[PDB]
Amino acid sequence: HEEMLKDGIRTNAYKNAILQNKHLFKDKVVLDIGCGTGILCLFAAKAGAKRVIGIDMSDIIDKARQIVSDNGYSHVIELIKGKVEDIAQLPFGIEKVDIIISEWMGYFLLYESMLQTVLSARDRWLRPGGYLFPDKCTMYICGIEDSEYKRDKIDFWDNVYGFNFSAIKADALREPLVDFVESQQIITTQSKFLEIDLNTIQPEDLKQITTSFEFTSQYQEYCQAFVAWFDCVFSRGPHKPVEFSTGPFTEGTHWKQTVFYLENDLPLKPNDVIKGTITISQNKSNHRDLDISMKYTVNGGAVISQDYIMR
Amino acid sequence: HEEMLKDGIRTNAYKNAILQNKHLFKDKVVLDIGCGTGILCLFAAKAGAKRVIGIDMSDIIDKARQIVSDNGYSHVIELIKGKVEDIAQLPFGIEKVDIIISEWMGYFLLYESMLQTVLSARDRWLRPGGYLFPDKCTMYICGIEDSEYKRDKIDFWDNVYGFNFSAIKADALREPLVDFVESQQIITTQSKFLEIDLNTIQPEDLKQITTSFEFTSQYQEYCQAFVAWFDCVFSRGPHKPVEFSTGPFTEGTHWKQTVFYLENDLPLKPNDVIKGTITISQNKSNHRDLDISMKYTVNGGAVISQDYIMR
């Protein structure tokens, strides 16, 4: 199924980062984590890499091997099946690589990401000073008006054909929504609240992420939710930076946005200052789940708290 | 995740079939296969069943137990975890039930359905003459014009940033698409091609389904695909029949429609007669996959053949 995903904004960014930098890729040894059908391997080979190693799961690697052969790069691109953890060593006696390509960003950047895997491949195989394509992501958050969706899809559970489905409402509030929002719904300024630099970040830094955000209301309005997204930069390597956004002001990507519904709507007035804290950690019961807690104030008022689990 | 699906057309049909037939449900013993959060159990209890047994998987049964308790029916509704196959016997010494409620229909009716499970629960537990809510489904097929989607999403694979992704095109053609189509795309009459009556069908009948269809072109047009859907009837039990459709002329359901792209577009003229054969069987390599082969003629011309695998 993933073998047929089309994300033009995504792929166009990788294409420019690689093919606009042939000078950089010429005779490098490139490793592609989670290569899928192999398009980024093909970009790397066309950019002049001398060796591309792509890793992914058995069935999709079989298809990519055929695509690489139809495109005349079997001599350059080698594709191996399995997880990075289970690979004792790279093929052909190769011990180091010059460039790691990956698509590590998950939903909300960190939900079901390949971040831990890319960091491990980096530590094992990247040469000092080698390049991660891409290497920086920045997360943004802001407040939106979203009462139609909240009434139709969250309050809906109070009266389901006359029955009380309140127990489901608590879960709807707890689960961040991966969905598109229209930029015209934004009612506050936009706050940067997280940066991940793959050049320097360490696995230990990702056990507990504690950060802050601050934005200002622009309207008299009730706020039903905060929406978050990330921008992505190919910062070291390209000769002019290449970046793309997953936010609501530009073309959609398969990451969409992430929507955090508030338990109680926030009465906002123009120039109200919302200051908050976000903690992110892997869920202890199910390590594939993500615990996200928020705490915030409006003009220094009482602390509103809310806890989320991405599952 | 399934705990939050809203399908109004679906649920409204079950609601009318049950609550418009309190006379029938009064003091019956009802079994609900795949009950989810429990709304149909609640309908059955409100309709006057004396005992409702709901079956589903562990985590969703925990939520439904709370919803049943908040709605005052714990004395009527008992919810058990697990698969029907792994349940040695029904609770409380109950050996027979009067009514089986289920949502057995899968995509394209038969892909990942609960059909085998409901038939097994029927044979084990339904009293002779007992009721299956619902018990009949009829499948329809017709031809559509769909060149914009075919060019954008199937021909797309011939030139992916200059690269040849043909190997992916073969797979796109082989995989039926579960998606909505607009009724205005239909360019032929509609053909009934399958009926499943849970009152009489036997498991052996579902190892190889061989059936036929016939429809007539209404336009001079190229046909890119056949679309199929099913209608569903609560036939024995209700005092006036209750039915709903998953077709493109009425409100959408979560089943959408199923689209079968032709390898080569079919040149159609008004009143051309398309006669065909559909065989359906479980895939031998992966029993969760569905093999669907079609063979058809236009005015008795050469046989066009096409094979599909729903995965």
List the structure tokens of A169: 């409402």
Helix (H) or strand (E) holding B80: strand B77-81
Could you tell me the fold of the domain covering A136-311? Hnrnp arginine n-methyltransferase1 (2.70.160)
A263 is a catalytic site residue: no
Contact in structure between B299 and B261 (CB atoms under 8 Å): no
CB contact under 8 A, B164 and A70: yes
Q: Are A308 and A176 in contact (CB under 8 A)?
A: yes
Chosen from B5, B68, B161 to mutate, greatest number of chain A CBs within 10 A: B161
Of A71, A160, A166, the CB nearest to B163: A71
Which of A275, A270, A311, A266 has its CA nearest to residue A294? A275
By DSSP bridging, strand B29-33 and strand B97-102 are parallel
Asked if B288 contacts B268 with a C-beta cutoff of 8 angstroms, the reply is no
SS3 A36: coil
- For residue A46, the distance in angstroms to the closest alpha carbon of chain B comes to 10
CB A244 within 8 A of CB A9: yes
Concatenate the DSSP letters of all residues of A73-85 into one string: -TTTEEEEES-GG
Q: How far is B37 from chain A (nearest CA, A)?
A: 9
Q: What are phi and psi of A195, to 5 degrees?
A: -130, 135
Residue with tokens 């407040």: A143
| Tokens of residue A43, six digits | 């970009």
How many residue contacts between A and B have a Cβ separation below 8 Å? 64
Q: Helix, strand, coil % (nearest 5) of chain A? A: 25, 40, 35
Q: Which residues on chain A are in Cβ contact (under 8 Å) with B39?
A: 160-161, 163, 165
Among chain B, residues having any CB pair with chain A shorter than 8 Å are 1, 3-4, 6, 11, 15, 37, 39, 42-43, 63, 66-67, 70-71, 153, 156, 160-161, 163-168, 171-172, 311
Closest Cα in chain A to B11: A161
The CA distance from A133 to A122, in Å, is 12
Q: Indicate if the alpha-carbon torsion angle A46, A49, A54, A59 is positive or negative.
A: positive
Q: Is B114 helix (H, G, I), strand (E, B) or coil?
A: coil
The 10 Å Cβ neighbour count of residue B270 is 11
| Euclidean distance between CA atoms B294 and B307, whole angstroms | 6
Residue B108 burial (CB count, 10 A): 26
Cβ neighbours for B180, distance < 8 A, ≥ 6 positions apart = B248, B252, B256, B257
C-alpha A279: how far from its chain's center? 17
* Dihedral sign of CA atoms B162, B165, B166, B170 in order: negative
Are A145 and A187 spatial neighbours (Cβ–Cβ below 8 Å)?
yes
Give the active site residues of B. 103, 112
Angular region, B229: left φ>0, alpha ψ -120 to 50, beta rest: beta
Rounded distance between C-alpha atoms, residue A260 and residue A309, angstroms: 10
Residue B192 burial (10 A CB sphere; 0-12, 13-18, 19+): middle
Residue A61 and residue A66: Cα distance in Å, rounded? 9
Tokens of A142: 């802001």
Q: Scan for tokens 């903690």, then name that residue.
A: A279
Report the residue from A67, A172, A311 with minimal CB separation from B167: A67
Residue A65's H or E segment, with its range, is helix A58-70
CA distances from A289 to A222, A309, A311 (A): 30, 7, 5
Residues forming beta bridges with residue B210, ordered by sequence position: B279
What whole-number distance in Å separates Cα of residue B166 and Cα of residue B169? Answer: 5
Beta bridge partner(s), residue B259 = B177, B227
Listed residue (A86, A100, A84, A89) closest to A18, CA to CA:
A100
**Environment class of A32 (CB within 10 Å of its CB; exposed 0-12, middle 13-18, buried 19+):** buried
- Beta strands per DSSP E along B116-272: 126-133, 136-144, 177-179, 191-197, 209-216, 221-234, 242-245, 257-268
CA–CA gap between residue B303 and residue B19 (Å, rounded): 49
Angle at B134 between CA B132 and CA B135, to 5 degrees: 65
Q: What experimental approach yielded this model? A: X-ray
Resolution in A: 2.5
Written as one letter, the residue type at B138 is T
Residue of B nearest to A311 (CA): B1
**Distances in Å between the alpha carbon of B308 and those of A252, B140, B145, B281, B305?**
31, 17, 19, 11, 10
**Of B116, B272, B256, B276, residue with least CA distance to B191:** B276
Residue indicated by tokens 């021909």: B155
Domain spans of chain A, in order of start: 1-134, 136-311
* Cα–Cα dist B271/B303, whole Å: 18
